Each structure stands twice: as structure tokens, then as C-alpha cells.
Amino acid sequence: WTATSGSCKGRCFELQEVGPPDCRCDNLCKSYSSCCHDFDELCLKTARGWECTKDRCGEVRNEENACHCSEDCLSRGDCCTNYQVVCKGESHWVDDDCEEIKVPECPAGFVRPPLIIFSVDGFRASYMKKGSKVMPNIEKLRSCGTHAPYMRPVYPTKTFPNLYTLATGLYPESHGIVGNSMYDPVFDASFHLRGREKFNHRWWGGQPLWITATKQGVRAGTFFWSVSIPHERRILTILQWLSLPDNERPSVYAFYSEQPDFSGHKYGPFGPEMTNPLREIDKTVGQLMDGLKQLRLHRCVNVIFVGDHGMEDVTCDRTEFLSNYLTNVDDITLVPGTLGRIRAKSINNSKYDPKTIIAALTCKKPDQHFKPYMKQHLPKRLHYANNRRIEDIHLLVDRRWHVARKPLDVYKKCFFQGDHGFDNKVNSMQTVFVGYGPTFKYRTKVPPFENIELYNVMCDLLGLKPAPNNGTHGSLNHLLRTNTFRPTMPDEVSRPNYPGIMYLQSEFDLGCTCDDKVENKLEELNKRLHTKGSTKERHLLYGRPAVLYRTSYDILYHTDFESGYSEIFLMPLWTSYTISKQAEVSSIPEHLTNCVRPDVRVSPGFSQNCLAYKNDKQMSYGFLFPPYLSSSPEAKYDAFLVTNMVPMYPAFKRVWAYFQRVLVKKYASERNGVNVISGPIFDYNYDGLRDTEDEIKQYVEGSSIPVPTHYYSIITSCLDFTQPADKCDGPLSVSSFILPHRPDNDESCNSSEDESKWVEELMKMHTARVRDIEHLTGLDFYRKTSRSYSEILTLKTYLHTYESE
């Protein structure tokens, strides 16, 4: 109950919300049916429209008008945004040449440049080029400021997950807004777009920018606008707030546009009906910039123009129905559309089985347009698993398609021609970023980057210390003229041992055998120097990775590769090797097919054993440095060391062998040499973070050898591919992957065919950032390069997406 009989007089768009049942006059009151009786009359004035005309100039202040063209309007802060243009011979902001903003040029009393966040729903990245003729204000922001060709949203590429990621710097799994629709089993409660539950604070985790600012004594504009308040009124309200006295005036403001998303759903992303919504958004930008210019704030404010996600062509006829696959369709609940989430209809049904649901959904039709996953098997780059609100069973839906439970759900719910929500790598889901203002660079293009990074930069823009988040602070310093954040490399926690020869062959009883008892002063000083690290500068190009947690591990040198070997996990944490463009691929000699050799630098007690693999009928083994790329028949023996061995399911060995035999040489040829770092990952609790020993759920049978959940590789070369990887003088180029270590290849529907038809497609799907691998392993890479640390942070956040242009 609200006693809606108080008044909004003098209170219109008040900045602190009042506690029921006193009536409200803030920009959100409509959404709560809590505005005072007189809110529309006082606060939502529309008389005479939104623009000064010739004959309104100098007029007598009529307070009924939506905006004013009288003489006192400038000092009142409530002129129509085109006042000075109509009545003072001034030019529109878009018609002025842009001039570099070297320093903030602000009115007296401003302690920092204000930040205005202008967010647009469904603004697909290619609108910047394709709609440029009809968006002159936006094009001026873009070309005069700092811009990215596109900005990558988070998954799912839905509105609320992405806006809240923008606000928090957190993945949806961490902030808790994991879709536009959700069930939380602990609350036993549901979140929906329509309705009241979404207002309850328990849905909304992390610390959004407005709370960060408030806690640190930076005043924030109430960010959110009830939908019926028109755009013109939102802009005028922001401009009025910017006229408050210094002690009351916010330093950060937000504008949100429901367009072009609203129309994009109805007409598709490039429907001829889409020109008008784009023109209208540009006009709103024009009104803000003209308004700032009137207030002499146009060279003082930092403006961010940012989208939440793009929009793809999707129609009712491109719907797959679970009723075409499942006999038991009534025993499941589906969250439907551009992603699928499945759980049991009733928790009292003990006959429901996710195993059989997944199987009935796997590779059942030749051109099936969704793929089912247990959430912990989704590509790690999605970071979409560690939340009780994310159902165990997930469907990744092909772009341009929908999934529904039953055909009745679609024709009793063709309306729409656009939608979004798909894999955040998809080109049509990419969105926009432009930063314009004193703190951004002038006429600068920056590479594509992920929206999780922006919270840190908005904090930087406001002099705020960011709450802990998933951005990599410093990776976007290259957007900024000043206020950069100067991070330090994390300190190494564990230093390595460098073991020499300490064990005799006969101390090992690992049940391993090798055909290698075959016999020199020249070449014996040689093998010794290699084992002391003589070739190390060739194979470890960027320093050894730092171990950022407490553990016991050894560095092992070899002719062709270097590794950091964990005495706790009984395998390398990392193995580093360089493969030049000239390198040759050889095969494993026949006599060496099942060769495993004891490593006399590492005790039997800290070694794997071959008997455990023999006894484990499910588990086999592979090598991290591939024997195929050995530099000489003699160096090849190093590759069969028990300290280079890792457990591998036979089904995964198909993947791994093709990577090592075919793909590594292919990249070396294409990139003029590559450096490769590979290693195991353990993430049994699917939280994206390195597991401790006591979190490991699976061991090679009868042993203490832990089974990795994933294998990674980081493949670095010179960005200037005219220089070989091992002799590179400038910026680097990287691609990485985190392959799930699975006992079957059910994920790849064509896996009964030759690896040349399916493995590279699997690797692409599991593309990753170096930063993702750092979280998962507790390692820090690129410790010693000649590049600036900010530049290295950017490289560590790079994702190679394999989408076309």
C-alpha cells in the first residue's frame, strides 16, 4: 500500500527514493504503482513538444511547457535542447568539426568529468557501418572518439544478463542473472521479465557501479527509467540533474533505449522498418549532445555508447521440438528459445534421468540445430555453469534457430523475425562500444574486447576502486588518455626445484618398459648441457610461467622442450616447446611404440606408473611434448619419459594425436613458427578455477594419478609473421584452447569419420583466452617479454573466435 496522496511539487525526479507508504516522485515510481497523484501533471509535462521554434524565442515562461525557450531557461537548466540553435544562432553539435579534447573543459565546481552511459538494447555491431548514413551524431561520436569494431557480449546474449554484466564486471554465473527467465531452487522462487519478483534484491549479486560509486562517495543518478517515460524527458531530466549545485549533482548517469531491440524482434535485424528506430536513436544522441553543448559540458563529460547484444534472423518455422526426440516430454520443464535449459517437472519423480534425456537428444537427426550438454561440458569460454540457477542440462541452439518443448508452445504463446541469446562468439550477437570525452583517446580504433572489462574502466573514469570482478584491470588501458590503472604482475608463490640425476634405473618399479639399451665424449657433453637448460632460450620464449599457489614442483630441461613437473599431481603443470617453420614431423619408431622411460631426476614415489594404466581398462595415456616433433632420433627418447606422460581416454587420444601430429606443424607453417605451452586442467567443481588436490573426483584406477577434466594449449607467434616465432621484435599473436577430456566423442556428431573432418572444428568450439587458462591452472604466463604489461594483459584477454568478417 502507498498513500499516493502526497505531492510531487518541487520533487520531480528526486534522487533518493522514499520509503512506502510515502508516495514517490523518482524515475522508477511508475514501475511500482507508487507515484504521487500529481506525478504526470508536474513531472511528465508534454505541452508544446520537445523543440523550440522561431516564435517561441524570448517567450514568457509558461511552466506548463515540456521545455522552455524563455530567457531564464539557461540559468534554470530547462531549455529545449535546440534552444541556442533556434534562438541564439548556435550550431548543432553534429555540425561542428571535432577538435581533440586534450583536457576536461568543465564549469567551476566540477570535481571530475561526469560519466554518461548511453546503452542501446539490441544494437548489433554492424549497424555502425550499415546504418551510418542515417546516424550522423553516433558516427561523429564514433569517428572522433575511441571505438571498437565490435564488443563481445557474455552468454547468454540476453538483455538482463548483459546489462548487469556491464554494471558489475561479472559473468552471469557470478552475478546471478543467468537468463531473462530463472528458477532458484534454494529460494524456491522464479524470476521473469514481466512482474514483481525481479525487484527483490536477492536475485542481484556482485556490486554494480551505482553501489560502488555510492560507497566511495561518488553520487549516482538513479539509473533506471520506467518504460512509459519518453526518451526526450529522460534526456531533459539528465540535463537538469547536471544543473544541480555541486553538493547535490550526480557524477554518473545512465540512459537506456529499448530500441533497436524492440523493432528488431518484429522485423529482423535488417528489416526495412529498422531505419526509423536507428534514425530515432541518433536523434536522441543529438539532443543530449546539443544539451551538453548549451550547458558548456560537451568537452567535459565522458560519454559511453554501448550495446548489450546484437540481433539475428529467427522465424517460427526454424524451431526444433523436443517432442520430436523425447517420448517423456511431459516430465520435463524447458526454458525455451535461443538456448535451452531442462530440468525435471517434479522433484518427486525419481524416475526422471538426465543421462537418458541427453542421449535421446544427441546426434539424432542429420542436420540437428541444437546440441545438448551437461553444463560442466559447455566450452569453458562461456563461463556458464557455476550457479544453482543454471540447469544441469543445456542446449546450445544453432544461430537462426529456436528450440521449444512442443509445437503447441509456438502457435499458442508467425509473430517475430529477430531474436538473440545464442553463443556469444556469433557475429550477429556482437554489439557496439564508443567512448568519447576528455578521458578517452582521440580518433582511435581499439581491437574488439569483452563487455566484462568495462566495469573496471567506468570505475577508472570515476576515480573508483572496482569491486572484485572478472575484468582484467589494465587490459583496456589503451582506450584511455589518462586515469590508466597501473597493475603489477602477481608475485610467484612457489619457486621450483631444479633436480639433477639422483636415481638409478633399478630403483623404479613402475612396470614400464622401453627398447632403449643402445650405446662418446663429443655428444655426451651435449646431452648434459641440454639437461642443464642449454636450449632453454629456444623453447621457453616468454619466461617460465609463475606458480601462484603453494605447491612442490620441478623444472625439467630437455633438448626439445621444458616442463614444470608437479610432485603433487604426478605430471607437468605446463610443458613449453618451440616448433619452427622448417621443423619436420616424424613418426614413432615401431620399437618405441609402448616405450615409457623412468626419469632419473624424479623419485619413483613422485612418478606415474605403467601398471595403473594397464589395470585401468578405461584409461590410457598420452604425452605433452609430442614424440612426432622430436628434433632427432636421439632427442626422441626424452619424449617417452614418464614425466611427460598424462592420462588420456582413448576417445580423447584421437583428438590429441591429431592436434600434435597434424595441427601443430600446420600452425608453424602458417604462422612462421609457434611456441606451444600445453598442460592439464582440473576443474571438477566447474567454477572456472584451479582445483586443489582434495577436489579431484577421479584417479587412474588403483593409483594416485589424478585425471584432468581438460587439456589446454597456448600457441604464440609473432604478430609480424615475417619474423619467426623465436626471433620476434614486437607484438605477439596468440590462440588457445581448453579441450574437454571426455571418454567419448558424443559432442562431435561426425567423429566416426577421419579426424581431418571433425577435430579442428572441436578445437575451434573450445577456443579460449590465456586468462581463462590462468584461472584454471593458477599459472601466470608471459612473465618475461619486451612488451608493456598492459599490452600483455590485452593479449591474455584475446579470444580467437574463428568467425568470418
Ligand X SMILES: *[C@@H]1O[C@H](CO)[C@@H](O[C@@H]2O[C@H](CO)[C@@H](O[C@@H]3O[C@H](CO[C@H]4O[C@H](CO)[C@@H](O)[C@H](O[C@H]5O[C@H](CO)[C@@H](O)[C@H](O)[C@@H]5O[C@H]5O[C@H](CO)[C@@H](O)[C@H](O)[C@@H]5O)[C@@H]4O)[C@@H](O)[C@H](O[C@H]4O[C@H](CO)[C@@H](O)[C@H](O)[C@@H]4O[C@H]4O[C@H](CO)[C@@H](O)[C@H](O)[C@@H]4O)[C@@H]3O)[C@H](O)[C@H]2NC(C)=O)[C@H](O)[C@H]1NC(C)=O
Ligand Y SMILES: Cn1c(-c2cnc(OC3CCOCC3)c(C3CC3)c2)n[nH]c1=O
Q: Which is nearer to ligand X, 111 or 489 (CB)?
A: 489
How many Å apart are CA 522 and CA 623, to the nearest integer?
30
460 is in an annotated binding site: no
- Stretch 749-778: interaction string toward Na ion, x if CB under 5 A: --x---------------------------
Query: What burial class does residue 329 get, using C-beta atoms within 10 Å of its C-beta: 0-12 exposed, 13-18 middle, 19+ buried?
Result: middle
Instruction: Indicate which of ligand Y, Cl ion, ligand X, none lies near residue 180 (CB less than 5 to 8 Å, by partner kind).
Output: Cl ion
What are the E-state strand segments in 389-442?
393-397, 402-404, 418-419, 431-436
> Any contact of residue 683 with Ca ion (CB under 5 A)?
yes
Q: DSSP strand E in 552-615: where?
A: 553-557, 562-566, 571-579
Pick one of 104, 153, 169, 179: the residue that binds Cl ion (CB under 5 A).
Answer: 179
Q: How far is the CB of 687 from ligand X (least distance, A)?
A: 6
Q: Does 176 bind ligand X (CB under 6 A)?
A: yes
Q: Find the part of the chain contacting ligand X (CB under 6 A) among 237-245, 379-387, 582-590, 755-763.
A: 379-387
DSSP letters, 198-262, are GGSGGG--S--HHHHHHHTT--B------TTS-HHHHHHHHHHHTTS-TTT--SEEEEEEEEEHH
Q: Is 691 in the site for Ca ion (CB under 5 A)?
A: yes
Residue 260, Ramachandran bin (φ over 0: left; ψ between -120 and 50: alpha; else beta): alpha
Among 66, 236, 254, 768, binds ligand Y (CB under 6 A): 254
456-488 burial code (b ≥16 CB/10 A, e <16): bbbbbbbebebbebbbbbbbbbbbbbebbbeee
* Least separation in angstroms between CB 763 and Na ion: 15
Given the complex with Na ion, which of 655 and 674 has the nearer CB atom? 655
- Determine the Cα–Cα distance for residues 345 and 529; give it in Å rounded to an integer: 66
Binding range to ligand X, per CB under 6 A, among 296-304, 363-371, 468-476, 728-736: 468-476
In sequence order, the 6+-apart residues with CB closer than 8 A to the CB of 246 are: 109, 110, 111
Residue 333 interacting with Cl ion (CB under 5 A): no
Does the protein bind ligand X through residue 381 (CB under 6 A)?
A: no
For ligand X, which stretch binds (CB under 6 A), given 171-179, 219-227, 537-545, 569-577?
171-179
Least distance between Na ion and beta carbon 753 (Å): 9
Q: What cell numbers appear for 698 in the block?
A: 577421479
Q: Which does residue 685 touch among ligand Y, ligand X, Ca ion, none (CB within 5 to 8 A, set by kind)?
A: Ca ion
Q: Which backbone phi and psi does 422 adopt, to 5 degrees?
A: -60, 170
Rg, Å, the chain Cα set: 30
Candidates 157, 451, 456, 469; binder of ligand X (CB under 6 A) is 469
- CA-based nearest residue to 234, from 286, 288, 282, 283: 288
Nearest CB to Na ion, comparing residues 96 and 746:
746
User: In terms of DSSP H, where are the helices of 256-345?
Assistant: 261-267, 275-294
Smallest gap from residue 735 Cβ to Na ion (A): 24
3: left (phi over 0), alpha (psi -120 to 50) or beta: beta
Q: For 690, which DSSP code?
A: P
- Does 685 count as an annotated binding residue? yes
Task: Give the span between the Cα atoms of 495 and 498, in whole angstroms.
Answer: 10
Q: Which does 613 bind (CB under 5 to 8 A by kind): ligand X, Ca ion, Na ion, none?
A: Na ion
Q: Considering the complex, what minimum distance in angstroms separates the CB of residue 155 from ligand X?
A: 13
Out of 243, 685, 723, 790, the residue judged to bind Ca ion by CB under 5 A: 685
Give the whole-angstrom CA distance, residue 545 versus residue 780.
5
- How would you class 513 by CB atoms within 10 Å of its CB: exposed for 0-12, middle for 13-18, buried for 19 or more? exposed
Which CB, 161 or 336, lies closer to ligand Y? 161
Beta bridge partners of 366: none
159 noted as active-site residue: yes
- Confirm whether residue 78 is marked as ligand binding: no
Closest distance of CB 390 from Cl ion, Å:
10
The entry of Zn ion, Na ion, ligand X, none near residue 261 (CB within 5 to 8 angstroms by kind) is: Zn ion
**How many residues lie near ligand X (CB under 6 A)?**
17
Roughly what angle, to the nearest 10 degrees, separates helices 789-797 and 770-777? 90
Shorter beta-carbon distance to Ca ion: residue 11 or 771: 771
Would you count residue 159 as binding ligand Y (CB under 6 A)? yes
Convert residues 132-171 into a mask of x (bound to Cl ion by CB under 5 A) and - (unbound): ----------------------------------------
In sequence order, the 6+-apart residues with CB closer than 8 A to the CB of 213 are 219, 220, 251, 252, 462, 464
Pairwise CA distance, residues 123 & 310, whole Å: 5
| Binding track, positions 207-246, relative to ligand Y; x by CB under 6 A | --x-------------xxx-x-------------------
Give the footprint of ligand Y on residues 106-125 (CB under 6 A).
117, 119
Q: Which of 32, 1, 433, 66 has the alpha carbon at shortest distance from 227?
A: 32
**Is the distance from CB of 1 to CB of 21 less than 8 angstroms?**
yes
Q: Is 420 annotated as a binding residue?
A: yes
Among 167, 540, 596, 681, binds ligand Y (CB under 6 A): 167
Find the distance separating the first CA and the last CA of the chain, reported in whole Å: 55
Is 393 in contact with 385 (CB distance < 8 Å)?
Answer: no
Minimum CB distance to Na ion smaller for 356 or for 750:
750
C-alpha cell at 554: 620441478
Query: According to the binding rule CB under 6 A, does residue 688 interact with ligand X?
Result: yes
Select from ligand X, Na ion, ligand Y, none the partner in contact with residue 119, using the beta carbon and a kind-dependent cut-off of 5 to 8 Å.
ligand Y
745 binds Na ion, rule: CB under 5 A: yes
- Quickly list DSSP for 460-498: HHTTPPPPS-SS-TTTTGGGBSS------PPPP-BPPB-
Residue identified by cell 503447441 is: 408
Nearest residue (CB) to Zn ion, 261 versus 312: 261
Q: Which residues on adjacent β-strands are paired with residue 113?
A: none
Q: How far is the CB of 708 from Ca ion (least distance, A)?
A: 12
Query: Is 330 labeled as ligand-binding?
Result: no
Q: Report the residue from 175, 399, 597, 769 that binds ligand X according to the rule CB under 6 A.
A: 175
Task: Determine the size of the site formed for Ca ion (CB under 5 A).
Answer: 5
Residue 608 engages Na ion in binding (rule: CB under 5 A): no
Q: Which of 157, 159, 439, 578 is catalytic?
A: 159
The CB-of-363 to Na ion minimum distance in angstroms stands at 6
Return the residue of 137, 212, 387, 643 that touches ligand X, per CB under 6 A. 387
| Nearest-angstrom CA–CA distance, 154 and 171 | 7
164 is a site residue for ligand Y (CB under 6 A): yes
Known binding site for 1-hexadecanoyl-sn-glycero-3-phosphate: residues? 159, 180, 261, 420
Q: Give the annotated binding-site residues for Ca(2+).
A: 683, 685, 687, 689, 691
Residues that bind Ca ion (CB under 5 A): 683, 685, 687, 689, 691
* Residues with catalytic function: 159
Residues that bind ligand Y (CB under 6 A): 117, 119, 159-160, 163-164, 166-167, 209, 223-225, 227, 254, 256
Q: Which residues are annotated as a binding site?
A: 121, 159, 180, 261, 265, 308-309, 420, 683, 685, 687, 689, 691
Q: Which residues bind Na ion (CB under 5 A)?
A: 613, 616, 620, 745, 751
Binding residues for ligand X, rule: CB under 6 A, are 170-171, 173-176, 205-206, 383, 386-387, 468-470, 688-689, 775
